Design a protein around this ligand. Structure first.
Ligand SMILES: Cc1cc2nc3c(=O)[nH]c(=O)nc-3n(C[C@H](O)[C@H](O)[C@H](O)COP(=O)(O)OP(=O)(O)OC[C@H]3O[C@@H](n4cnc5c(N)ncnc54)[C@H](O)[C@@H]3O)c2cc1C
Length: 369
């Protein structure tokens, strides 16, 4: 029986663990934190990621308690500039805890061995994983799913193109306060852009009937807009129609202003070691495909490992097959981010929706645009 060691309990790590377990691997997943949990408030999932969930046997628990807006609307200075529904292309909004729990319950039901307070500090291409305590573990496959700053990746050494965003945002989960919002289309996803009187943007995303996912974006150089707890006055001023929700957001003393970095590597494999998720391809958040590609890649890895070839050969075949979809998505997302293309509306074109249209289960592209 083949054994796999997965470093990282994030969406990519859980996806890989479950996919491998389903194919008969003995699997152990290592999470450095003392508890299994996800940060980031909310998250968007598209057709490609929803298919992975179906392939993992975790779709049902995710759909129940999640939300699909009637439309994805964009505003520029409070003027609606577009409403797109992606020609039937499936998508869903949910809190990260909701998605994380579905994956963790599924992993537990399958018998995946989860170790907390277990931090991987090094990986050997020959099939060895070293923990922070010094303990060395041997396996037939090592999966590096430890996010940005990946110690597994850095212990082997990959050529890396790195970039860091000077500006960030505050992501929060607050009550819907739907009735207090009054007249409007408050079940819609609404990306509210503003450049005047100042640069402030809010991504409004309902997760279900009780929770609302908000993304408050302001320049790092803005002392008021980027502060946490949020500076209520400055947000209500440019988004008065959301005052009821903003009032609730101002009470979250745990809010944080997060920035991000992007990563592109020369390769994702080395011997029996495979890198997945952020550790391998963190990207700009514009297309909301970070977790989507991560899960597709983690799931595809388990597929290529079922061809009867050696793990080393399976890994390079995996990257050759699946990598182009991620590279292209990462690049386009990079362009959108830099040029603030989403502020124009109608930007979810066929090209931008390429990764979302991919169906990892049948390995073909669906929902034509
Ligand atoms: C502002 C913003 C908005 C985004 N919105 C979306 C969206 O709407 N939809 C979408 O699909 N994607 C989105 N993304 C991208 C998405 O967040 C990531 O791609 C994905 O969640 C990360 O996958 P991961 O599991 O590989 O990373 P992680 O998320 O961090 O995986 C690593 C986990 O392993 C643990 N760990 C770290 N080091 C070690 C170690 N050495 N040993 C053991 N364990 C370790 C950590 O506790 C960590 O939780 C967004 C990103 C940003 C910055």
């Amino acid at each position: 029986t083949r054994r796999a060691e997965v470093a990282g309990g994030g969406f990519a790590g859980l996806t890989a663990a479950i996919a491998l377990k389903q194919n008969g691997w003995d699997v152990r997943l290592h999470e450095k934190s003392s508890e299994l949990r996800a940060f980031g408030a909310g998250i968007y999932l598209w057709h490609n990621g929803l298919r992975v969930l179906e392939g993992l046997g975790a779709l049902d628990d995710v759909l129940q308690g999640s939300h699909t807006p009637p439309t994805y609307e964009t505003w520029m200075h409070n003027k609606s500039v577009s409403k797109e529904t992606f020609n039937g292309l499936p998508w869903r909004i949910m809190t990260r805890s909701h998605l994380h729990d579905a994956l963790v319950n599924r992993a537990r039901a399958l018998g995946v061995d989860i170790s907390v307070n277990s931090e991987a500090v090094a990986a050997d291409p020959v099939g060895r994983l070293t923990l922070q305590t010094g303990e060395v573990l041997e396996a037939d496959l090592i999966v590096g799913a430890d996010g940005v700053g990946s110690k597994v990746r850095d212990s082997i050494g990959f050529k890396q193109d790195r970039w860091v965003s000077k500006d960030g945002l505050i992501r929060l989960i607050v009550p819907r306060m739907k009735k207090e919002l009054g007249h409007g289309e408050w079940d819609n996803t609404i990306d509210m852009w503003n450049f005047w009187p100042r640069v402030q943007r809010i991504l409004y995303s309902p997760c279900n009937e009780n929770e609302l996912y908000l993304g408050l974006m302001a320049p790092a150089a803005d002392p008021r807009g980027s502060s946490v707890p949020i500076d209520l006055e400055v947000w209500v001023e440019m988004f008065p129609f959301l005052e009821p929700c903003l009032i609730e957001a101002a009470k979250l003393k745990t809010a944080r202003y997060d920035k991000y970095e992007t990563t592109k590597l020369d390769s994702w494999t080395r011997g029996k070691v495979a890198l997945v998720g952020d550790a391998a391809h963190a990207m700009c958040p514009a297309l909301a495909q970070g977790a989507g590609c991560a899960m597709v890649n983690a799931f595809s890895l388990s597929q290529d490992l079922e061809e009867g070839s050696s793990v080393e050969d399976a890994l390079v075949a995996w990257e050759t097959r699946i990598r182009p979809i991620t590279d292209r998505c990462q690049a386009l997302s990079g362009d959108y981010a830099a040029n603030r293309s989403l502020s124009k509306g109608n930007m979810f074109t066929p090209a931008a929706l390429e990764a979302a249209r991919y169906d990892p289960l049948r390995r073909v592209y669906s929902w034509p645009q």
